[PDB]
């Protein structure tokens, strides 16, 4: 057996309330910087899909 060099849990992160960009006032990008997880257009579409308006809000 061979042990592969990669430590897969390198992108392991958690954010409650971290720093925000001045213009958008939205969580700033950066795992180590206590950054936010992006909820993109597809996740927006999925939250519209369930008809779950408060989850989207």
């Amino acid at each position: 057996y061979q042990r592969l060099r990669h430590m897969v849990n390198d992108k392991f992160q958690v954010r409650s309330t971290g720093p925000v960009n001045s213009l958008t006032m939205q969580p700033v990008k950066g795992r180590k910087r206590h950054g936010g997880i992006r909820v993109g257009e597809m996740e927006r579409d999925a939250l519209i899909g369930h008809g779950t308006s408060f989850l989207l809000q």
Partner: protein
């Protein structure tokens, strides 16, 4: 968001308009005049971009609101432009109005009556009355002013009456009606108006010509001088003026021209610039297109970017400073202009100084707004347009999508010990993720502990929010302070201004919380479900159960998942009742399950439920409690009930199937009866020995009495045990059964393991003998097939010289090699199938159930019989891109094999298996085929990302209304009923499973409790009507659809399905009645009918359901499975793109399906195919001999040697007479034109230019004589023309050229014209073929589209059944409803080919949306143009362009589209937002 902080005011609508200079000057906090930003020392300079009046900056307080950098919102300032500038966004519009106006009377050059006609039509369109706008054109009486003014009066009278009449009724409000079709009619008119405006040259009011205005890329206009004809026209029309009493043009001159024109033509422009009536009564002024000032955004949005130590200057400040430098310079130029003047004459310099001043400030203004409109600087700084469209754009990157708080990301790890509805949360996340829990009397105990525990001990609390609004962090505090604050949580508020409020505790995420689990890409809503938090100690990864693997399409190969922690109870309720896992058992794509156990559990079940599996009292009870724990609420009886043993004497023993009975007996409700189901297994009875019935899965009163349980029962498979339980007992019970079975099989695999080894891969000595004997016949097959394709009798030897020459002919042609490959492959694959059928399983040493390799393939746990056969028998023929192994120019497939080897092995046929090993030749061939697949995964440009994105943006608003109809975001009707029956796909499964429903009558009657509904519905109205429609339907059964009765329409059209029992789809009605007739079986046939009627009632789609998104997700998500290439017509994503994304009128493969009659034979149809197929001259010619002889004149003897007359007449249906006409009329005229063109090309360019660089690579009859003489008179170069009239085999003609024409390549010239000459062609059709009858229907497939031509072939084709794939062509001839039906059929063909089932309810919705305008609109920028929401449009693409169109319309965004609501932070109107919640209060 704080629930303690409610908001009383709300934004209901957004109005788009232009800021006036006067407006900006008043609101401005400070006038910006200085280009410098900082004074010395470091303080902001007064009158600069960093002035403190624009807000708090550099630890200084704001000089306007006085607040610091945190609380100061920032303030807008202004730059005073020394000269007006064209606003870049509205330059194109002001340009249109400048070119359209007269420079003398200062009216538009179009006649006043024509202008008034547009103003009238546009006023009527402000209100929703299109019919009236067209009826205005009917109002009709070089024409006198007294007559034309009466026409304007009569037209204005009709407009005032039509508005008032519609205003009296509910046709239009005072604010005016506005729909997409109304918008389409407005957009058409405003376009037509500007087109008519620009077309007029000479002014229709005063006959004088105006000088034409030209433009460049940048905002700058020039005036082209008039021609002498137009200058003399100005002179003769100069006297009539008296009785009434290229050069650059400055911005001021243009503004002054438009100022008067916008005053004089105010009436039409009032309706040209207002989408709805102008209730504000504002004047439409020209200065809206001009900028006399520039607003300076607050310092807050122009802060210098800090990256580590370096503080970088803001790019907007840089562009603004540039505008400030130019402004100071023009102020000096105007000051010097003011000084001096007596001395003038040479005024060409003062205008040149002015032109520079104007073009410089304009460029600086342009550079700030839109950089792609400014001059090139030696990458430029991005403008505000560029800021809104940087990449995807501000709307897409920061509004439609956002980075969020209270969220975590981690690699997922599998876990069978957690519930199927749970998520294993690491304690790392649990101590950081908090919920704002308000402290009350009922939870003071729970939160006091959390407060004491603090932020590092779970379950704790990171913070405490007091009722005054302040926050107290528990992070730095010791156990002593935390204990003190806990005893201060429920203290009454002294302040009366906050007595309403109570303290909040920001408590750690507990085991009762909801979380949103997300696995990207989120192709369908099942990839974003709600999970129950289960904090697992000593964990560093997110733990997920195997039942969730399918929906997320997540494999534990180092995958990552996003965890979202919603922060309020309304968001909690949604994640627990709507988006929760259990409510996502069935996908809306096909209504089939996406939840079930995956591998060990399937293999465990086949063993546990096997007859051989017995268990003692101790063992049996252990397996029960092992998976069912009453303390964890798994039971429904508060005491574990146990069945008696199946064996009493000698020893008490329980069967394996009894454990499955006991698990159901403790998880299903006691009040309801046991499940009754007769299903089947994946494992055939033959495997379980003689006379076994172990394939028949039998459940009688919730007891497994026969058959084992496969992937077909507790996997994500339809009509299995879990699905049957889901239908009878609900989603919560099915979830419990899945978790219970999941535990049972995990525990069973721990006590009784499952393994795979070499013994499972071996064949017996008998079985291996069979393998070698069948594979012994494969040696002959190679040469046999090679002798068949080559056409050689008695089967010639492998080393035959004629055969080897014949195989070479095949090698050089791609088509010929294809015939050889397909024949040899089919023959060797037949030998493969024989080996596999004989050896597996009757020849395997170890056999099922003990052969685990065999077991896993049969159970559906993992692998198939194909993989099993490659392991134990042979790999077979290695197929490469539909064919065999690639062959070299030498005829060798490898250097080891003989050239043109007639052997199966040489072609890639592997006789070897993976157990015994594969030979090096076979190894290399396997390497080819193995890699071939990975190469396809690398070269696959087709993506379902953009296809789904285009559908979702146009369908987001589309949902189910409370009136059961499918309505868009703006209230416009898309469908009158979902799929025409209003059924939820996630319910339409057992609705036709009548036998199932009958066997579970009392179970379902208790489920669909009618006792609490009988008083709310009608039991006869619809049922009576259903009989009346069935009566008229049976009367016209044999009659065609056009002759069918239209007296009574469907029962669903007249009676609400949720209020009238019996208002069911005629499809369901026919199916239900047919079951009661064909099956005569204490349940009556009448009481069963009522239950099924009630089941349909309870299967209705809920009002609010986002059927739009669901439809696009149901077309998008499975279109990912068709990313692979073809194994003629366009398939997969490219074909789906031709329909949905581009709505192409020019399809790649246009076809026509012609249904042939019964009276037309197979020979007659093939003759008919030839009659329509395009015939070229090339197709009938065998040889062309050109005898170039130079004598006296270049003589060219062109002899056309065709194929035999009977040969081409039987192969193309072409006569000798038909050949004569084409050569004598078309071919010679085409040949003469080609020779003349070649003579010119020879004399034009003598050769390429040397030294100059070229672009980089990367005896005759009397009748014959009259015919020849007539052709000589019609052709300038021919002398002779003789054609075979008797036999019809040749055509000879002599061509005479000049002595100066010299050398020419006639053969190549002739060749090219022959394949260009058409003998017979039916317009737009290339070839008509005869394929195999499709599902029993005799049809002909055309490679072209022309209906009118096929209409003439009524004797052969049924003109009422002529199908076509081309949607636009169908729409043009047969109408919108026919095109609509073509869209639903064609999209279905794309999915049916890849064996993917998509509910027609989705396709019908998509088609209805494409045909909403009566045309064929695609899901793209073009189709979207006719949509109400400008915000939805802005968040799709060309944000500034759609914004410009919105401002010019003076549009009101009603905030009714999902996109618009997200933009303004309003709650989405879909699902939970489709209503309002009001509280009932008792006191008056």
């Amino acid at each position: 968001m704080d629930i303690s902080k409610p908001v009383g005011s709300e934004i209901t609508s957004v109005d788009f308009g232009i800021l006036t200079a006067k407006e900006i000057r008043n609101l401005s906090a400070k006038q910006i005049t200085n280009p410098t930003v900082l004074d010395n020392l470091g303080h902001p300079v007064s009158g600069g971009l960093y002035d403190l009046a624009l807000g708090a900056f550099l630890r200084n307080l704001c000089s306007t609101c006085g607040l610091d950098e945190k609380f100061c919102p920032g303030h807008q300032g202004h730059i005073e432009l020394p000269v007006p500038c064209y606003n870049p966004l509205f330059f194109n519009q002001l340009y249109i109005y400048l070119r359209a106006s007269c420079l003398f009377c200062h009216h538009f050059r179009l006649k006043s009556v024509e202008v008034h006609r547009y103003a009238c039509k546009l006023r009527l369109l402000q209100y929703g009355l299109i019919d009236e706008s067209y009826k205005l054109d009917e109002i009709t009486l070089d024409i006198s002013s007294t007559l034309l003014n009466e026409l304007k009066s009569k037209r204005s009278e009709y407009v005032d009456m039509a508005i008032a009449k519609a205003l009296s009724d509910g046709r239009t409000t005072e604010r005016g009606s506005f729909t997409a079709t109304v918008n389409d009619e407005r957009k058409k008119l405003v376009h037509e108006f500007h087109k008519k405006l620009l077309s007029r040259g000479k002014c229709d009011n005063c006959g004088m010509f105006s000088p034409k205005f030209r433009k460049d890329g940048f905002t700058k206009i020039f005036e082209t001088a008039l021609n002498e004809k137009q200058i003399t026209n100005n002179r003769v029309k100069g006297f009539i003026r008296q009785d009434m009493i290229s050069t650059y043009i400055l911005s001021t001159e243009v503004k002054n021209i438009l100022d008067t024109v916008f005053r004089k033509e105010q009436c039409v422009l009032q309706y040209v610039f207002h989408s709805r009536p102008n209730l504000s009564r504002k004047l439409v002024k020209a200065d809206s297109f001009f900028m006399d000032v520039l607003v300076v955004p607050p310092t807050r949005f122009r802060l210098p970017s800090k990256l580590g130590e370096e503080v970088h200057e803001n790019s907007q400040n840089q562009l603004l400073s540039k505008v400030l430098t130019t402004s100071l310079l023009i102020r000096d130029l105007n000051d010097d202009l003011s000084k001096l003047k007596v001395s003038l004459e040479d005024r060409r310099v003062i205008f040149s100084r002015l032109m520079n001043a104007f073009v410089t400030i304009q460029n600086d203004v342009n550079a700030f707004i839109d950089s792609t409109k400014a001059q090139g600087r030696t990458v430029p700084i991005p403008g505000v347009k560029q800021a809104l469209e940087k990449k995807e754009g501000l709307f897409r990157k920061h509004m439609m999508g956002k980075r969020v708080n209270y969220a975590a990301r981690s690699v997922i790890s599998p876990d069978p010990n957690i519930e199927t509805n749970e998520i294993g949360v690491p304690p790392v996340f649990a101590v950081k993720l908090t919920y704002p829990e308000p402290v009350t009397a009922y939870n003071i105990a729970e939160l006091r502990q959390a407060v004491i525990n603090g932020p590092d001990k779970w379950p704790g609390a990171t913070q405490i929010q007091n009722e005054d609004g302040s926050l107290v962090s528990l992070i730095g505090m010791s156990v002593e302070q935390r204990k003190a604050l806990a005893n201060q949580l429920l203290t009454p508020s002294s302040n009366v201004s906050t007595h309403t409020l109570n303290k909040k505790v920001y408590r750690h995420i507990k085991n009762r919380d909801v979380v949103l689990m997300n696995r990207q890409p989120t192709l369908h809503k099942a990839s974003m479900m709600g999970h129950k938090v289960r904090v697992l100690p000593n964990e560093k990864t997110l733990r997920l159960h195997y039942a969730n693997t399918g929906a997320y399409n997540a494999d534990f190969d180092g995958d990552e998942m996003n965890m979202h922690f919603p922060q309020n109870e309304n968001a909690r309720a949604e994640a627990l009742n709507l988006a929760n896992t259990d409510s996502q058992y069935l996908t809306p794509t096909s209504g089939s399950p996406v939840r079930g156990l995956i591998q060990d559990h399937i293999s465990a079940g086949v063993w546990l439920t096997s007859k051989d599996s017995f268990f003692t009292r101790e063992q049996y009870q252990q397996y029960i409690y092992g998976c069912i724990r009453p303390e964890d609420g798994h039971t429904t009886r508060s005491k574990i009930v146990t069945l008696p043993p199946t064996i009493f004497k000698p020893y008490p023993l329980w069967t394996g199937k009894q454990i499955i009975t006991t698990v159901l007996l403790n998880v299903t409700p006691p009040d309801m009866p046991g499940i009754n189901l007769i299903s089947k297994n994946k494992i055939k009875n033959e495997y379980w020995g003689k006379g076994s019935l172990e394939n028949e899965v039998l459940f009688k009163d919730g007891a497994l009495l026969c058959g084992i349980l496969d992937k077909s029962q507790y996997g994500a498979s339809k009509y299995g045990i879990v699905h049957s339980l889901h239908e009878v007992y609900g989603p919560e019970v099915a979830a419990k059964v899945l978790s219970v079975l999941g535990r049972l099989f995990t525990n069973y695999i721990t006590a009784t393991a499952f393994t795979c080894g070499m013994d499972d891969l071996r064949l017996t000595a008998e079985g291996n003998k069979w393998r070698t004997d069948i594979l012994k016949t494969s040696v002959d097959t190679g040469r046999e097939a090679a002798a068949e394709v080559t056409n050689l009798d008695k089967d010639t030897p492998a080393d035959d010289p004629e055969l080897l020459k014949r195989l070479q002919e095949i090698l050089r042609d791609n088509n010929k090699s294809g015939i050889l490959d397909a024949v040899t492959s089919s023959k060797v694959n037949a030998i493969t199938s024989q080996v596999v059928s004989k050896c597996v399983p009757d020849g395997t040493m170890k056999k099922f159930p003990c052969n685990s390799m065999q077991a896993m393939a049969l159970s559906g746990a993992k692998g198939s019989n194909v993989n099993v056969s490659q392991i134990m028998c042979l790999l077979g023929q290695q197929a490469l891109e539909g064919r065999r192994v690639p062959v070299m120019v030498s005829g060798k497939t490898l250097p080891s094999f003989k050239p043109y080897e007639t052997d199966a092995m040489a072609g890639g046929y592997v006789k070897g298996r993976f157990y015994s090993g594969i030979k090096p030749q076979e190894y290399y061939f396997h390497c080819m085929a193995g890699r071939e697949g990975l190469i396809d995964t690398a070269v696959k440009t087709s993506r379902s990302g953009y296809l789904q994105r285009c559908l979702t943006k146009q369908l987001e608003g589309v949902h189910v209304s409370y009136d059961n109809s499918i309505r868009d975001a703006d209230g416009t009707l898309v469908q009158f009923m979902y799929g025409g029956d209003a059924i939820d796909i996630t319910k339409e499964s057992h609705m036709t499973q009548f036998e199932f429903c009958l066997d579970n009558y009392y179970a379902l009657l208790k489920k669909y409790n009618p006792s609490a509904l009988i008083e709310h519905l009608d039991v006869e109205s619809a049922l009576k009507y259903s009989k009346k429609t069935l009566k008229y339907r049976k009367k016209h059964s044999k009659e065609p659809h056009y002759k069918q009765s239209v007296k009574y329409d469907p029962v669903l059209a007249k009676y609400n399905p949720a209020k009238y029992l019996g208002s069911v789809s005629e499809n369901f009605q026919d199916k239900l009645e047919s079951f009661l007739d064909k099956n005569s079986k204490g349940v009556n046939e009448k009481k069963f009918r009522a239950l099924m009627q009630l089941k349909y009632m309870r299967s209705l789609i809920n009002p609010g359901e986002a059927v739009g998104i669901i439809a696009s997700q149901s077309v998008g998500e499975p279109s990912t499975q068709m990313t692979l290439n073809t194994f003629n017509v366009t398939l997969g994503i490219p074909r789906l793109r031709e329909i949905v994304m581009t709505a192409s009128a020019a399809i790649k493969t246009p076809q026509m399906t012609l249904p042939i009659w019964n009276d037309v034979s197979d020979e007659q149809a093939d003759t008919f195919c030839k009659s329509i197929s395009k015939v070229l001259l090339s197709e009938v010619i065998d040889k062309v001999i050109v005898t170039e002889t130079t004598g006296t004149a270049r003589s060219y003897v062109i002899h056309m040697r065709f194929f035999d007359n009977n040969e081409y007449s039987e192969e193309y249906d072409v006569s000798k007479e038909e050949l004569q006409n084409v050569i004598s009329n078309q071919f010679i005229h085409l040949l003469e034109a080609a020779i003349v063109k070649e003579i010119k090309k020879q004399k034009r360019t003598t050769g390429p230019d040397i030294g100059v660089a070229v672009p980089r690579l990367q005896n005759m009859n009397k009748v014959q004589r009259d015919r020849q003489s007539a052709i000589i008179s019609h052709h300038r170069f021919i002398t002779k023309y003789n054609f075979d009239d008797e036999s019809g085999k040749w055509c000879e003609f002599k061509l005479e050229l000049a002595a100066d024409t010299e050398k020419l390549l006639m053969v190549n010239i002739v060749e090219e014209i022959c394949r260009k000459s058409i003998i017979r062609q039916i317009p737009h059709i290339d070839r008509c073929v005869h394929p195999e009858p499709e599902n029993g229907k005799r049809v002909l497939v055309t490679e072209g589209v022309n209906f009118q031509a096929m209409w003439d072939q009524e004797a052969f084709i049924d003109v009422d059944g002529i199908t076509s794939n081309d949607v636009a062509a169908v729409l043009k001839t047969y109408g919108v409803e026919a095109a609509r039906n073509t869209i639903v059929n064609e999209i279905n063909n794309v999915f049916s080919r890849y064996a993917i089932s998509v509910s027609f309810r989705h396709l019908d919705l998509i088609a209805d949306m494409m045909t909403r305008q009566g045309t064929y609109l695609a899901f793209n920028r073009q189709g979207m143009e006719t949509s109400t929401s400008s915000f939805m449009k802005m968040s799709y693409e060309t944000t500034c362009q759609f914004l410009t169109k919105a401002v010019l319309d003076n549009e009101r965004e009603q905030l009714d589209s999902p996109s618009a609501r997200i933009v303004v932070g309003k709650l989405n109107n879909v699902g939970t937002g489709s209503f309002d919640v009001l509280a009932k209060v008792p006191n008056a």
